[PDB]
Amino acid sequence: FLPFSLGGPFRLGGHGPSFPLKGITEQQKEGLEIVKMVMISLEGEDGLDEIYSFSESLRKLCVFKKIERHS
Amino acid sequence: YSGRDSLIFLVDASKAMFESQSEDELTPFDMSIQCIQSVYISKIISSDRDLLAVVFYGTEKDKNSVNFKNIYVLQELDNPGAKRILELDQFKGQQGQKRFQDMMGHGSDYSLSEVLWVCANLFSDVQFKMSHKRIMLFTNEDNPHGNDSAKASRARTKAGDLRDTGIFLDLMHLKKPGGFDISLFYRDIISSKLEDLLRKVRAKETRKRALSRLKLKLNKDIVISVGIYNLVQKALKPPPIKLYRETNEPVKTKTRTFNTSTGGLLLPSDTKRSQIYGSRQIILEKEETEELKRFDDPGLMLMGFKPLVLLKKHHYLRPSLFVYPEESLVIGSSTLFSALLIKCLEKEVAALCRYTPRRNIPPYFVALVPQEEELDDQKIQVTPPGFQLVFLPFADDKRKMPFTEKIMATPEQVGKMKAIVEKLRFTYRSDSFENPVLQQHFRNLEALALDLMEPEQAVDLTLPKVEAMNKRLGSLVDEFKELVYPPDY
DNA sequence: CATAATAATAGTTTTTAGTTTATTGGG
DNA sequence: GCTAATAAACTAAAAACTATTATTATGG
């Protein structure tokens, strides 16, 4: 889960859109490519439930996942 | 509008309660007594803000504070209550009729103008906000204008005064029901329902005065005065007033915070709210709690416009409330909303807001269903022009289901069961639901207010049957249920 | 300081709002 | 082999219905 983001409706102030991952360090690019040929084989439930991006873990209780038990 | 609906019960004493008078029943005394008793019970269960008094036009020996001749004053204007029920039970049935014979008797001489005099006195007696004043009267004597013409003229004059005063009078069929034959000439001053009056439908409480009015602060610039109201109510348990089981004396249950240790009366000040979570008791305070609930001022801040097409059954919450346009400090509210309703064919895109109920409490997103001026041809404003407050849920308002997605069956099942359900079409009736616990409770209250032998258990329309639909439709539903081992295990 | 000044600051019963009340529950 | 997950009821509750008295203005 990259330190940056992985790879009217305008009411006010939603979560972060994204963050750079391509122009980032060439070492970061190499590691990202290896872990992405892994990702197509293993993208994990840790990201399937919600992909960890620094953009999307800011505003609201989306992590808190507002819900109660089933009847 | 608050107001006490004063109702007077004029019942004869000479023969109109005792002569068949073009009928064959017993003395109308008993039927009239049971009718008025029923309506008293209906008020007790349904309306205790309406004053009642019973008068006997015709009186051999006067029972009257007015002391006027031919006046029998039994109950003064007052809200319905058990003393009056006992009072009438004295004169209920043929036993009550022979009582009436005992203390004053029937065949009683009448004084019509004096009756109007004394009932006017009774009306003058009230000292409270009055909503309505009606004279309720039954008489076999539909047209006793055979009296002296002076009495008839004076009575008509008094009628003109009282209806001019606003006093209302009702005479209803007792001799020649229907065909306008009843009141052969006492139709002059008066211009059926026995079944309803005996039926005494009750337990109906409804709004009397305005309440909960706000403004449509749609933007930071515009507000629009409005009012929030309810017509769907959750029936309550009547208040358990703790009475001394011996002496019927109320209870001063002195409940307070305190200390289990040092025997001192604590206060909200020297105490603090707290939240035992994880490794930290998260402390709070009463005003801290209010602030945590204190978000914004009450009113309607417009958050958008959504079509009346996204709204679905799963898009539902607590029963919706209503908004009527109001003009107390916002001119044009009614005018602009009239524009909205005329262009409501295009305004299926209804208003969106996060409604703030009051101060110190948070707003909540509640949609607004545009209520038109749906005035019926009989001039009933069903759904008065306004907005129904269907409440927008949150992710809070969810309790998830599993996902065992089920697939449709063969269309012959759908067709045969469509034929079933439309053949078994239950007659639509919105005013058809009465709760058996509620009804039986009313019956226990009224019955165990007198020495009634038993409170009837009201068989309600809400009760399903076994054969009424099995004769309107039949077992062809089960025969159509052709699958092996039907759910009739 | 003159002395009946005649508005708000509640008085009201409001219904209607969060109250543990409750049992199926992991062995 | 065990042990909630509720929800009947909580027990309450904030609403102007109403406004007399003070208002401090003007005879005294």
Q: Could you say which of B303, B400, B402 has the minimum Cβ distance to residue A67?
A: B400
> CA–CA separation, B455 vs B452, rounded Å?
7
Rounded to whole angstroms, the maximal C-alpha distance in chain B is: 96
Cβ atoms B299, B354 nearer than 8 A:
no
Determine which helix (DSSP H) or strand (DSSP E) holds B74, and give its type and residue range. strand B71-78
Q: How far apart are CA B206 and CA B196, in angstroms?
A: 19
- The first and second tokens of residue B422, run together, are 């439309």
B220 touches chain A (CB under 8 A): no
For residues B358 and B257, is the Cβ–Cβ distance under 8 A?
A: no
Measured distance CA(B298)–CA(B300) in Å, rounded: 7
The DSSP symbol for B67 reads -
**Cα-trace Rg, chain A:** 15
CATH top-level class of B4-205: alpha beta
Q: Which residue is nearest to nucleotide C13 (CA to C1')?
A: B209
Distance CA B156, CA B139 (A): 17
Paired tokens of A42: 């293993």
Q: How was this structure determined?
A: cryo-EM
Cα–Cα dist B33/B58, whole Å: 16
B400 touches chain A (CB under 8 A): yes
Q: What is the four-CA torsion angle of B411, B414, B415, B421, rounded to 10 degrees?
A: 180
**Contact with chain A for residue B277, Cβ under 8 A:** no
Say how far apart CA B131 and CA B166 lie, in whole Å: 11
Note whether B398 contacts A69, CB cutoff 8 Å: no
* Domain B234-296 listed as CATH 1.10.10.10: no
Q: Are B213 and B228 in contact (CB under 8 A)?
A: yes
> Which of B304, B396, B400 lies closest to A70 in CB terms?
B400
Residue with tokens 């240790």: B261
- Asked whether this chain's domains B234-296 and B395-489 adopt the same fold, the reply is no
**Which chain A residues are within 8 Å of B305, Cβ to Cβ?**
none
Contact B362, B293 (CB under 8 A): yes
Q: Report how far residue B36's alpha carbon sits from residue B50's, in angstroms, rounded to the nearest whole number.
A: 14
Q: Which residue shows structure tokens 């319905």?
A: B80
Domain coordinates of chain B in residue numbers?
Answer: 4-205, 206-233+297-394, 234-296, 395-489
Residues from chain B contacting residue A70 (CB–CB below 8 Å) = 399-402
Distance, in Å, from the CA atom of B205 to the CA atom of B238, rounded to the nearest integer, reads 12
- Distance separating alpha carbons of residues B456 and B454, to the nearest angstrom: 6
Check whether residue B208 has its CB closer than 7 Å to nucleic acid strand C: yes
Instruction: Answer whether B168's CB lies under 8 Å from B135's CB.
Output: yes
Half-sphere exposure of A60 (CA within 13 A, CB side): 9
Of B9, B148, B22, the residue nearest B91 (C-alpha): B9
Residue type, B287: E
d(CA B391, CA B320): 7
Q: In chain A, helix, strand, coil percent, each to 5?
A: 25, 0, 75
Cα–Cα distance for residue pair B140/B26, rounded to 1 Å: 12
The crossing angle, in degrees rounded to 10, of helices B28-46 and B82-89 is 170
Interface residue of B301, B400, B401, B404 to substitute, partner A, most A CBs within 10 Å: B400
Distances in Å between the Cα of B227 and the Cα atoms of B97, B374, B384 are 52, 18, 12
Angle between helix axes B149-165 and B112-125 (nearest 10 degrees) is 20
Pick the CATH number of B206-233+297-394 from 3.40.50.720, 1.10.10.10, 3.30.565.10, 2.40.290.10: 2.40.290.10
Among residues B167, B168, B170, the alpha carbon closest in space to that of B186 is found at B170
How far apart CA B275 and CA B288 sit, in angstroms, is 13
A67 interface with B at CB cutoff 8 Å: yes
Q: Within 13 Å of residue B101, how many CA atoms lie on the same side as its CB?
A: 11
Q: Which CATH architecture has domain B395-489?
A: Orthogonal Bundle (1.10)
Tell me the pairing of strands B4-11 and B130-138: parallel
**The residue count for chain A:** 71
Q: Is the CB of B234 under 7 A from strand C?
A: yes
Chain D, protein-covered positions (CB within 7 A):
5-7, 9, 11-12, 14-18
How far, in Å, CA of B12 to CA of B28, rounded? 10
